Design a protein around this ligand. Sequence first.
Ligand SMILES: *[C@@H]1O[C@H](CO)[C@@H](O[C@@H]2O[C@H](CO)[C@@H](O[C@@H]3O[C@H](CO[C@H]4O[C@H](CO[C@H]5O[C@H](CO)[C@@H](O)[C@H](O)[C@@H]5O[C@H]5O[C@H](CO)[C@@H](O)[C@H](O)[C@@H]5O)[C@@H](O)[C@H](O[C@H]5O[C@H](CO)[C@@H](O)[C@H](O)[C@@H]5O[C@H]5O[C@H](CO)[C@@H](O)[C@H](O)[C@@H]5O)[C@@H]4O)[C@@H](O)[C@H](O[C@H]4O[C@H](CO)[C@@H](O)[C@H](O)[C@@H]4O[C@H]4O[C@H](CO)[C@@H](O)[C@H](O)[C@@H]4O[C@H]4O[C@H](CO)[C@@H](O)[C@H](O)[C@@H]4O)[C@@H]3O)[C@H](O)[C@H]2NC(C)=O)[C@H](O)[C@H]1NC(C)=O
Ligand SMILES: *[C@@H]1O[C@H](CO)[C@@H](O[C@@H]2O[C@H](CO)[C@@H](O[C@@H]3O[C@H](CO)[C@@H](O)[C@H](O[C@H]4O[C@H](CO)[C@@H](O)[C@H](O)[C@@H]4O[C@H]4O[C@H](CO)[C@@H](O)[C@H](O)[C@@H]4O)[C@@H]3O)[C@H](O)[C@H]2NC(C)=O)[C@H](O)[C@H]1NC(C)=O
Ligand SMILES: *[C@@H]1O[C@H](CO)[C@@H](O[C@@H]2O[C@H](CO)[C@@H](O)[C@H](O)[C@H]2NC(C)=O)[C@H](O)[C@H]1NC(C)=O
Ligand SMILES: *[C@@H]1O[C@H](CO)[C@@H](O)[C@H](O)[C@H]1NC(C)=O
Lengths: 52, 110, 126, 51
Amino acid sequence: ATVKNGTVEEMKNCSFNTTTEIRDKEKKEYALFYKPDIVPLSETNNTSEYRL
Amino acid sequence: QSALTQPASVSGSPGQSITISCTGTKYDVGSHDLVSWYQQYPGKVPKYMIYEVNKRPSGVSNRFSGSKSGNTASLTISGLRAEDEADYYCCSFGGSATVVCGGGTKVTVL
Amino acid sequence: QVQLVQSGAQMKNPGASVKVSCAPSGYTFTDFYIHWLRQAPGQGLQWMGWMNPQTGRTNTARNFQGRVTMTRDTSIGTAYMELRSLTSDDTAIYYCTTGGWISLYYDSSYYPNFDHWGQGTLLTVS
Amino acid sequence: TRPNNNTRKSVRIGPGQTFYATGDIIGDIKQAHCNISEEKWNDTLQKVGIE
Ligand SMILES: *[C@@H]1O[C@H](CO)[C@@H](O[C@@H]2O[C@H](CO)[C@@H](O[C@@H]3O[C@H](CO[C@H]4O[C@H](CO[C@H]5O[C@H](CO)[C@@H](O)[C@H](O)[C@@H]5O[C@H]5O[C@H](CO)[C@@H](O)[C@H](O)[C@@H]5O)[C@@H](O)[C@H](O[C@H]5O[C@H](CO)[C@@H](O)[C@H](O)[C@@H]5O[C@H]5O[C@H](CO)[C@@H](O)[C@H](O)[C@@H]5O)[C@@H]4O)[C@@H](O)[C@H](O[C@H]4O[C@H](CO)[C@@H](O)[C@H](O)[C@@H]4O[C@H]4O[C@H](CO)[C@@H](O)[C@H](O)[C@@H]4O[C@H]4O[C@H](CO)[C@@H](O)[C@H](O)[C@@H]4O)[C@@H]3O)[C@H](O)[C@H]2NC(C)=O)[C@H](O)[C@H]1NC(C)=O
Ligand SMILES: *[C@@H]1O[C@H](CO)[C@@H](O[C@@H]2O[C@H](CO)[C@@H](O[C@@H]3O[C@H](CO)[C@@H](O)[C@H](O[C@H]4O[C@H](CO)[C@@H](O)[C@H](O)[C@@H]4O[C@H]4O[C@H](CO)[C@@H](O)[C@H](O)[C@@H]4O)[C@@H]3O)[C@H](O)[C@H]2NC(C)=O)[C@H](O)[C@H]1NC(C)=O
Ligand SMILES: *[C@@H]1O[C@H](CO)[C@@H](O[C@@H]2O[C@H](CO)[C@@H](O)[C@H](O)[C@H]2NC(C)=O)[C@H](O)[C@H]1NC(C)=O
Ligand SMILES: *[C@@H]1O[C@H](CO)[C@@H](O)[C@H](O)[C@H]1NC(C)=O
């Protein structure tokens, strides 16, 4: 969570692939989410992969 | 860069009250009243005399005072003498989370 | 009150990058925001950046993006300036100032209350 | 309050319809908190104990 350096302890910076309005030109996007809204995807040590 | 608008010099005589002026956008001068003023003898550090548009720090003489109307401000000095011969600067709350400062005004007590 | 000290002199050449120190004395370093400003000879005062020593966050001016970076120290306590991609026009005096008070409940970074000033340093590049 | 100067970001999700999220944060990070005056709260809880 390198917002302006440091770490914001509540909000994670995440990026995801968006199926755009044309549906065959999907693009990368980024957003900041709250950690109550973010769940780890698997119990393994792939801890950079998350879900709503 | 913008660096506000500030006159090059000011004139006056002893006994007169004068104003040191600064003018800018409504974000930088008027959206918040966080306007401070700094003063520079030649070869010295900038000195702290006005904060929060019209308040004074430790030990500063009460002859100095501030003012603000809309998107301008002026350090108002009552009763000049020759000791005020220096350069003057204003600084204020910048655009996003920054501080912005002016171009410098020389005090010329004739 | 309290007093900051800085580096003695910085005579350099273009493309070398510059470190400036700022050691406080009289007060606890991890209490106030630290601002960095620049003053050219015969030109008005330029504001360069601010940094929170409690959290390590920092911001600079929009014209100074990428060229200006800053860090902190916890063991002794000082503020580190490093200037990158510099040219001859940065021949100027450089000032380290003590800003507003750090509170966890409201933002106090952009308060231009430079209450204490260091002696500055000279950067001469030609 | 929320003393954290947030910024809204707009993403287009599918045809015609949009979605709003949190983009950058400007300024320093501060904690969301709420305040109650202490003497009124102690007075109120003592009166609740009275009742
Ligand atoms: C929720 O709720 C919450 C609660 O619960 C909240 O929160 C909050 O908020 C608020 C807001 O407002 C805040 O407040 C803030 O605060 C800050 C801080 O303060 C603090 O501190 C200080 C300092 O301390 C230090 O020093 C001292 C001496 O001086 C000592 O003693 C101590 O100890 C310390 O020491 C240091 O150092 C050492 C070494 O040396 C070490 O060791 C240690 O550790 C440390 O570090 C202090 O001072 C204070 O106190 C004060 O205050 C009180 C009350 O008022 C009083 O009573 C007392 O007496 C004192 O005094 C004062 O006053 C006087 C008058 O009479 C004066 O004269 C003096 O000087 C003093 O000041 C405390 O403790 C503060 O600071 C602030 O204030 C400021 O700011 C504002 C704005 O920001 C303004 O307006 C004002 O005016 C002020 O200003 C000033 O200051 C600054 C700095 O900061 C500067 O810059 C300026 O310029 C000024 O200064 C100048 O001027 C003056 C005159 O003009 C002079 O005097 C001086 O000298 C200079 O020259 C504010 O108030 C709080 O904090 C909070 N809390 C917490 C917990 O955080 C919230 O908000 C809520 N929320 C909502 C939403 O609402
Ligand atoms: C809290 O966060 C919010 C965001 O959520 C912040 O709000 C932003 O505030 C800034 C300014 O405070 C504002 O920026 C201006 O937006 C205008 C949009 O119309 C721009 O036109 C304007 O541009 C001028 O400045 C730029 C540099 O920043 C220049 O690149 C540009 O060319 C303009 O400068 C010219 O014009 C002036 C005036 O004539 C002249 O003097 C100059 O020399 C130059 O010629 C600004 O960019 C953002 O739009 C705001 N954002 C939002 C989303 O509203 C707010 O500031 C934060 N508050 C705190 C306290 O942190
Ligand atoms: C969130 O992460 C994104 C990455 O997707 C960051 O955006 C990049 O930041 C780097 C570092 O400065 C730049 O080199 C890139 O140009 C940025 N990319 C884009 C598309 O802007 C973003 O800065 C992060 N934001 C926060 C608040 O942490
Ligand atoms: C963090 O700060 C260092 C030194 O000030 C800098 O070089 C680095 O680019 C910064 N990182 C971010 C993400 O701002």
